[PDB]
Design a protein around this ligand. Structure first.
Ligand SMILES: *[C@@H]1O[C@H](CO)[C@@H](O[C@@H]2O[C@H](CO)[C@@H](O)[C@H](O)[C@H]2NC(C)=O)[C@H](O)[C@H]1NC(C)=O
Ligand SMILES: *[C@@H]1O[C@H](CO)[C@@H](O[C@@H]2O[C@H](CO)[C@@H](O)[C@H](O)[C@H]2NC(C)=O)[C@H](O)[C@H]1NC(C)=O
Lengths: 262, 49, 49, 52
């Protein structure tokens, strides 16, 4: 079933990556960072991969009008009627599923994908991709005529059924955080926040371990300790822009959508 | 046409790493010392250098 | 040879073995960032096409 | 982005549109010896001048 098609996606979550240019020529950390663009089809139907997943809500459920994205340590939702893809003009979105957007764009030089936030902000990521199509045949037309010939060509179907091509799945690593520390007189207080926290302090002796509560360590400065979130029960995509956890072994496989058809 | 597969880098804090050779086409591996990675939250490890 | 026809070689479509020569070179990452920099000559199949 | 003309437009109290349009040949060449368009994720630092 359509809802049953995302049985695997119940075990994956989005992530935040490093976007070199996110609107105003300032490298930033973005939840919609692009990874790769594939243009195998001769029709000219670009397939774009980016961190944010489309088709699932924060409650881990099917919904075609919501996009779930990582924000801080949590998962937030955005409306699906606020997704824009542009090369030099406004493109046209043909299909979406999970990690992938299948669209078509006019000739240009740079590709930009933008979404809206909960606070009505705009989060966009833009990369360079020299794209121009030449249609199959011996004529460089632009718009389909109303009388002509039929030539075989290759395109991408909208079917979401299982396909041979796969993508890898890995354990997300511990994310350092500095907003979980407070200074009180001459001690450091760290708060659980509802997640397992691994802590390493240098002051004193035997002040290293893992905790699930709010603790106070006496005679220690705030810069003297490091805490990191370590729960990470979900799975994350193996991206070169994020560090790899201690285990160097593969953890999962996820089927890719939109195969190539004649 | 081909593709390049590059997995996520391994970052080791307060230690050393050494990668062994495998039987893969044009496999290239390297180890770099003296790195101070950064993330959205903060520094990744105590060890400076 | 890299950059020309025959950069990626295979006896048949279903063959599990492969011969590759594309000059994949790694570089040291920029300070204060997590990434892997690599330089590689583009695919020779596209250039031949 | 590159282009030949420039238009500046605002909205009126009566919800009208007030715009002015002039000609100005704009084509920015990035500094250095490469004619790129998007900042890369790995490269070199070169001095440049900007507006604060
Ligand atoms: C375009 O049509 C051709 C012809 O049917 C497809 O190529 C064949 O695919 C089958 C798959 O089972 C192979 O067994 C044949 O050997 C292929 N033919 C040749 C001559 O190699 C091709 O797959 C179609 N294009 C797409 C994108 O599916
Ligand atoms: C906690 O951090 C301390 C450093 O603040 C780590 O201690 C270092 O361990 C390496 C490994 O041999 C030594 O080379 C360094 O000299 C140590 N530094 C100091 C200041 O003693 C310690 O390993 C960390 N522990 C955990 C569990 O991460």
């Amino acid at each position: 079933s359509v809802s049953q098609h995302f049985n695997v996606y119940k075990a994956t979550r989005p992530y935040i990556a490093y976007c070199a240019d996110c609107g105003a020529g300032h490298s930033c950390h973005s939840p919609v960072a692009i990874e790769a663009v594939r243009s195998e089809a001769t029709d000219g139907m670009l397939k774009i991969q980016f961190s944010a997943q489309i088709g699932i809500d924060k409650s881990d459920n099917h919904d075609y009008t919501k996009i779930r994205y990582a924000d801080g340590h949590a998962i937030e939702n955005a409306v699906r009627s606020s997704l824009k893809v542009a090369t030099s003009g406004d493109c046209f979105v043909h299909g979406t599923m999970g990690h992938f957007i299948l669209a078509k764009c006019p000739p240009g030089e740079f590709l930009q994908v933008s979404i809206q936030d909960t606070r009505n902000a705009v989060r966009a990521c833009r990369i360079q991709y020299h794209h121009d199509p030449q249609p199959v045949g011996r004529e460089k037309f632009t718009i389909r005529p109303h009388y002509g010939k039929e030539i075989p060509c290759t395109t991408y179907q909208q079917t979401t059924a299982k396909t041979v091509e796969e993508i890898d799945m890995h354990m997300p690593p511990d994310t350092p955080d500095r907003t979980l520390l407070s200074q009180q007189s001459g001690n450091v207080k760290i708060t659980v926040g509802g997640k397992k926290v691994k802590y390493n302090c240098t002051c004193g002796t035997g002040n290293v371990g893992t905790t699930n509560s709010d603790m106070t360590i006496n005679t220690c400065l705030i810069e003297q300790c490091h805490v990191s979130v370590t729960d990470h029960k979900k799975w994350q995509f193996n991206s070169p822009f994020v560090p790899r956890a201690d285990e160097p072994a593969r953890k999962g496989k996820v089927h890719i959508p939109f195969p190539l058809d004649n | 046409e081909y593709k390049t597969v590059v997995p996520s880098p391994y970052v080791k804090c307060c230690g050393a790493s050494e990668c062994s050779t495998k039987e893969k086409p044009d496999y290239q591996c390297k180890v770099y010392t003296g790195v101070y990675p950064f993330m959205w939250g903060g520094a990744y490890c105590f060890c400076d250098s | 040879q890299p950059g020309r026809f025959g950069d990626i070689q295979s006896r048949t479509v279903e063959s599990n073995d492969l011969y590759a020569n594309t000059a994949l070179k790694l570089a040291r990452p920029s300070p204060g960032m997590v990434h892997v920099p690599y330089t590689q000559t583009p695919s020779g199949f596209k250039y031949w096409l």
